[PDB]
Amino acid sequence: LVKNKCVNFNFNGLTGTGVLTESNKKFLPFQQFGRDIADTTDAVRDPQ
Amino acid sequence: QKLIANQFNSAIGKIQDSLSSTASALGKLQDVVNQNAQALNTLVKQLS
Ligand SMILES: *[C@@H]1O[C@H](CO)[C@@H](O)[C@H](O)[C@H]1NC(C)=O
């Protein structure tokens, strides 16, 4: 993966484009994705 | 003159206290923001 650069990612079947950034603020116990009020992905966890 | 001066000062203090205490006086300004937010949220949710 490459960070802080507009890429076309693909994480375990979810697609889209964005600027991947370090997100240590978010805590995920076992969950994979993330979501917002309008049901949009704002955070993912790296499978590797 | 002194009577009107005192009455005006007391009225100003009273309205300041009323604004500080009660919270439902500004509905005419909050409802516009709520309506706009709901409209945008519905427009975004229509994507799915
Ligand atoms: C995946 O393999 C790498 C290779 O060293 C290792 O560092 C990492 O801990 C592994 N992660 C999982 C979830 O298997």
Q: Flag if B41 and A39 touch (Cβ within 8 Å).
A: no
Please give the helix or strand (H or E) that residue A12 lies within, else none: none
DSSP letter (8 states) at residue A29: S
Residues of B with CB under 8 A from a CB of A: 41, 44-45, 48
User: Which of A35, A36, A39, A42 should we substitute to test contact with B (largest number of B Cβ atoms within 10 Å)?
Assistant: A39
Q: What does the block give as tokens for B44? A: 């975004």
Quote the CA–CA distance of A47 and A18 in Å, as a whole number.
Answer: 18
Q: Flag if B48 and A37 touch (Cβ within 8 Å).
A: no
Quote the CA–CA distance of B3 and B5 in Å, as a whole number.
Answer: 5
- Strands of B1-48 (E only): list them: none
**C-alpha angle A7-A10-A15 in degrees, rounded to nearest 5:** 90
Please give the helix or strand (H or E) that residue B13 lies within, else none: helix B2-21
Q: Which of A45, A26, A21, A38 is nearest to B44 (CA)?
A: A38
Reported resolution in A? 3.5
Experimental method reported for this structure? cryo-EM
Quote the CA–CA distance of A28 and A21 in Å, as a whole number.
Answer: 16
